[PDB]
């Protein structure tokens, strides 16, 4: 399955039903025929497959990377230290891309789920998408095709110096 914490879904609330008319509902009968002719044979095939899988159970692991010194702690011209720091920054940048994708996925799922109520009931997902987008822009916007840890750091220091100047004038 998946993590209900990473990809949250509200609980379903399906009505009774309470049919008034005496006519038979064709969808109800078509679903019963579907659940017999189609769903049932497909489940048996899947259960057979899952039984075979358990006899050959293998495992795989999510790789862990220990932190290495940041670009801030590298002497300039120290290519061995710059390389490891730069490779670490590329790994983090990639993971940031997928965090953006998760937040947009929540936003899209919520809009569809809320329908005509999306302008009111998507406030938290829209705010998180707004916050996480601000943070993304600060790290990575305008770095260019040759983006790197050195350019990201130069972009941060330029922003910090402007924030400090504005605060000092206050």
């Amino acid at each position: 399955s998946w993590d209900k914490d990473v990809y949250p879904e509200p609980p379903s609330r399906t009505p009774a039903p309470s049919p008034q008319t005496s006519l038979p509902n064709p969808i109800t009968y078509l679903t019963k025929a579907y659940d017999l002719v189609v769903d049932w044979p497909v489940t048996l095939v899947r259960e057979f497959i899952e039984r075979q899988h358990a006899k050959n159970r293998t495992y795989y692991y999510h790789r862990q990377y220990r932190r290495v010194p940041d670009i801030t702690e590298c002497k300039e011209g120290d290519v061995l230290c710059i390389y490891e720091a730069e490779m670490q920054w590329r790994r983090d940048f990639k993971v940031d891309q997928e965090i953006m994708n998760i937040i947009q996925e929540r936003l899209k799922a919520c809009q569809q789920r809320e329908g005509e109520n999306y302008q009111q009931n998507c406030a938290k997902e829209l705010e998180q998408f707004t916050k996480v987008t601000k943070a993304y822009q600060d790290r990575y916007l305008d770095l260019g095709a040759y983006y790197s840890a050195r350019k990201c750091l130069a972009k941060q220091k330029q922003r910090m110096l402007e924030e400090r100047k504005a605060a000092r004038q206050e």
């Binding site: 891309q97 953006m100 994708n101 947009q104 996925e105 899209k108 799922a109 569809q112 329908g115 993304y136």
Partner: peptide, 17 residues
């Protein structure tokens, strides 16, 4: 009821799937 159905992930361009 209305649906959004996704059948295949084609390619991810950084923060655009």
């Amino acid at each position: 009821m209305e649906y959004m159905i996704t059948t295949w992930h084609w390619v991810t361009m950084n923060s655009m799937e």
